[PDB]
């Protein structure tokens, strides 16, 4: 569960699964090859600030 130290941009959400009781999304990362795709839980993809701003703007 160790994170890459960097910050990255989601290009596409490709697939969904459940691992150990947690939903994960297969992410294609912008600027990176398809071989770099990773499975991530929601918390890695979405901050609380993201959720609130998205809500307040809708």
């Amino acid at each position: 569960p160790k994170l890459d130290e960097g910050f990255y941009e989601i290009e596409a959400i490709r697939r969904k699964r459940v691992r150990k009781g947690k939903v994960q999304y297969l992410i294609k990362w912008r600027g990176w090859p398809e071989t770099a795709n990773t499975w991530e839980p929601l918390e890695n993809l979405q901050s609380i600030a993201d959720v609130i701003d998205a809500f307040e703007g809708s």
């Binding site: 160790k2 994170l3 990255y8 990362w29 991530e40 890695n44």
Partner: peptide
């Protein structure tokens, strides 16, 4: 977004 480092 944050990313998980690959398995080694």
């Amino acid at each position: 977004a944050r990313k998980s480092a690959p398995t080694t």
